[PDB]
Design a binder for this molecule. Structure first.
Ligand SMILES: Nc1ncnc2c1ncn2[C@@H]1O[C@H](COP(=O)(O)CP(=O)(O)OP(=O)(O)O)[C@@H](O)[C@H]1O
Ligand SMILES: Nc1ncnc2c1ncn2[C@@H]1O[C@H](COP(=O)(O)CP(=O)(O)OP(=O)(O)O)[C@@H](O)[C@H]1O
Ligand SMILES: Nc1ncnc2c1ncn2[C@@H]1O[C@H](COP(=O)(O)CP(=O)(O)OP(=O)(O)O)[C@@H](O)[C@H]1O
Ligand SMILES: Nc1ncnc2c1ncn2[C@@H]1O[C@H](COP(=O)(O)CP(=O)(O)OP(=O)(O)O)[C@@H](O)[C@H]1O
Lengths: 212, 212, 212, 212
């Protein structure tokens, strides 16, 4: 039989876009095609407001938009636990929390774009122990992105190449390079982003005067 | 004051995708930014079933999906006149028909991707008289696409470069290369296309067993 | 052992670019990786000057630029035969000519980008009999291009589908969408195209005042 | 008259690629088109071997490959100073060094891709004071990359926004996303990278058995 899998995606979702959503769909089809897994749930976990330095919309707004974006999904949901904590938390700690909730068994895997995968190399950006825990205790499903070579990132990492069984590279045959930065700039200029992010999210943004 | 403009997009829309929809939004923002125009309406006109040679879904299905895709649009509508004619018709003839309907005044412009623009060069593909009529009697709004250089296509065409005032090049700052061919293949393989085309269109496709 | 193969690329090569050259390298590695072919030669065949609408540099110059571009290749050569003929010739006839030239015969295959494969669908562009002879008697090696879905083009064409074993889809994780159209426009504006086309080609264009 | 400018590109150049070289040409044409600058020299400065996690070819080889790649450039040279230092140095210190070297002084500007500009946002990556000194005392010329929105990065950073007059955004309608990571993987698999990196660089890699 197949192994139950839960996909967890961390990030800003400022705001959530059709690309963030597509990422789950591609990752699920990929895992199913292997024959070894059955994805049972997707979780969008927006980052906390204390995180880094940037014009991030308040967390309850990002959580609300993600919930709206996901109303037509029968398997992906937003979980505000991370954004509701007092302070920002390293990714691995969010994975532990959700793993615990699962035990109250499905394998919990981190879901991300190939660009996040490239950051594992940035000096003083990720503790090696954390990278090891992600691919050894949990798993990693990476969706391709233009200009990134996930296969090489894995091969050149002493930690990643040792845990390839738990790293899944999902190929994105559709060029969809929507960046939320662009979405925010467009909105600020009063330009349309319809068909780039969910209609309901656009409505929420307008109703609450976000990204003006 | 501004000149009223109606945008007309011909094509297969087999099925309509989020990219076809985005094309209208980008074209409208572009024309408005010039200050010279006010886009008052968008029209999706699906090609007739006698057209060329291919696995085209029945026209009433393509019209229905486009209508569903456009339910959340307050300015773009589908017009089945073209698909309802007895036989396929050259683009310019569809422009004449819609121009007539407008008179029962707004400028009617053809809307298309930069790839369509490149076909103007293909031997025995477009009558020069028709290309001239399009950019001289009507107008052309072209949305950019990866690998195409609209500015060069215009400059190298003796007909197009003489009517640049009526040709509008709208830039697409977002890499969104979704092809309907891929959508159909994915659907046939039972893969997800959610977030690539409208939810309602996906439902219609499933309900009517299209692209199996 | 392996079936010997010769690759033939037809096109404008106005001017030849690094992408046109990359196309050969990608196709050769793909055929070799199948384990059953050995590519022994590549042929660049610039189109005749009587062809099409677009105004191209003289074939004398396009052949010269290809020769210069190919000085550092040990397996690809330019063949002027096609451009030296009194008038434009259909692709199938150029294949027949080069096949005769090879007369334990190697297989001669047409090398092209996925955009060319999509034109097989265009009404009144290719004679069905030519499409059949090309994929059945010669073979097609298609290199991927953004926005094109070769697999779908093949599945939706009864002729390509029936002979799909003779169509080899090659691709690399590199987004290299440089159009010669852009190249000419840039040259016309006095901008650099260094590192987009070979240094030797740029020298010839400057020395002979082309693309002004 | 025009302000003389020197462009400095820092990075791994592991190995230097046609895209790294194209970056200089695009930046120079952009600065010249503003009508107020005259680019007099370009400097490629390979990073020190003590830098980061990823295992890079020896700096001796990366400097050699850049020198060979640059033999056909009449304005860009490689400068080994940075890689010859006992240990890795922050970008701002390399700029200061080269600025001193130039000591009616030309303006020295950092040349990079938009992805680098996005890293300014990363928590604990750059010292705010360094970001300020880079954009205020030197200048930044950023070349566009797919998926990045430089204009938005600048608008959302108070430091970049305040000094945006010293940040020059250059870009060309060419999708050239070749990653050196892909290059190394391909070389490791015995595949061709001809026409993606200079011929002279490929010869050196083969002669010295690099990237095995
Ligand atoms: N267009 C795209 N294609 C594939 N993955 C994408 C994507 N856009 C975002 N992602 C992925 O979605 C996850 C969350 O992204 P975010 O944290 O919201 C940064 P972003 O989406 O790039 O917006 P930004 O421009 O504000 O940084 C990441 O794993 C990222 O890789
Ligand atoms: N991803 C995209 N980006 C920009 N324009 C697009 C686009 N996809 C389609 N278009 C435009 O939408 C209009 C209609 O396209 P269609 O006639 O449906 C062919 P298509 O969308 O490429 O599907 P196909 O693969 O079945 O041919 C054309 O003007 C085309 O240029
Ligand atoms: N960037 C690219 N990637 C892959 N194949 C490409 C390519 N650019 C061109 N080709 C292929 O190279 C062959 C010859 O192309 P040409 O006939 O010269 C037209 P082109 O190269 O698109 O320039 P154009 O802008 O003048 O039309 C074709 O098979 C085409 O598909
Ligand atoms: N395809 C491309 N287009 C524009 N800029 C590019 C580029 N590829 C790399 N660059 C730029 O070239 C400079 C040096 O890059 P490097 O430090 O060598 C990392 P890289 O080139 O991405 O290879 P990598 O895959 O090993 O990381 C950077 O400013 C980077 O932004």
């Amino acid at each position: 039989s197949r192994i139950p899998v839960v996909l967890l995606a961390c990030g800003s979702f400022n705001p959530i876009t059709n690309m963030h959503l597509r990422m789950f769909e591609v990752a699920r089809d990929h895992l199913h095609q292997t024959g070894m897994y059955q994805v049972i749930q997707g979780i969008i976990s927006p980052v906390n407001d204390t995180y880094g330095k940037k014009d991030l919309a308040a967390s309850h707004h990002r959580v609300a938009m993600a919930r709206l974006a996901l109303q037509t999904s029968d398997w992906i949901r937003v979980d505000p636990w991370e954004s509701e904590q007092a302070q920002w938390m390293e990714t691995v700690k969010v994975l532990r929390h959700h793993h615990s909730k699962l035990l109250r068994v499905p394998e919990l895997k981190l879901l991300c774009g190939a660009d996040v995968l490239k950051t594992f190399q940035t000096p003083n950006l990720w503790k090696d122990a954390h990278i090891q825990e992600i691919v050894e205790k949990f798993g990693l499903v990476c969706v391709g992105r233009v200009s990134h070579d996930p296969k090489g990132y894995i091969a050149e990492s002493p930690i990643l190449r040792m845990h390839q069984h738990n790293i899944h590279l999902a190929k994105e045959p559709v060029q969809n390079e929507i960046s939320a930065t662009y979405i925010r700039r467009a909105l600020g200029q009063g330009q349309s982003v319809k068909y780039l992010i969910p209609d309901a999210v656009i409505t929420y943004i307008k109703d609450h005067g976000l990204y003006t």
